[PDB]
Amino acid sequence: KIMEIKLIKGPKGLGFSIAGGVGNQHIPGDNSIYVTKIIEGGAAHKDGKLQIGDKLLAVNSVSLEEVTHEEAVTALKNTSDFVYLKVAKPTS
Template identity: 55%
Template sequence: FLYKTITLERGPDGLGFSIVGGHGSPHGDLPIYVKTVFGKGAAAEDGRLKRGDQIIAVNGQTLEGVTHEEAVGILKRTKGTVTLTVLS
């Protein structure tokens, strides 16, 4: 497994990816994974984030043990430059 740090600039199209998983998900306690990278948005422009990548942290805030809703909230609240720690 390889850790990588991906820095995205949140633009008008947002970060451009959706997530799946989380603590207490219907499938049990899961890490947060990238579900879809949309055709437009910061992630598509950057090109490094892939479906199935595990998101470990956002701007240094760990996603370990967070629910899906909490993870979505953390991603929504981050403005401007967003640094993702990713395991792929």
């Protein structure tokens, strides 16, 4: 299940933590970026769509598939104010 989440970047960012990445696998065999924590009162929390365990596909034009952890952190920190976050809700 793929969805697009609309977020306004707050002073402290998008308001979630990530794990994963090429060379830093969160799930054995998977390079994907995963949401690990939703920050209380942050943009992602207030929107209510994003959940722990969701896979990030893209942040605006930037793919987060088959990227390093540092690449995804950079991407998420340096987005514009208005963010279209594409995510995949896990099945298992």
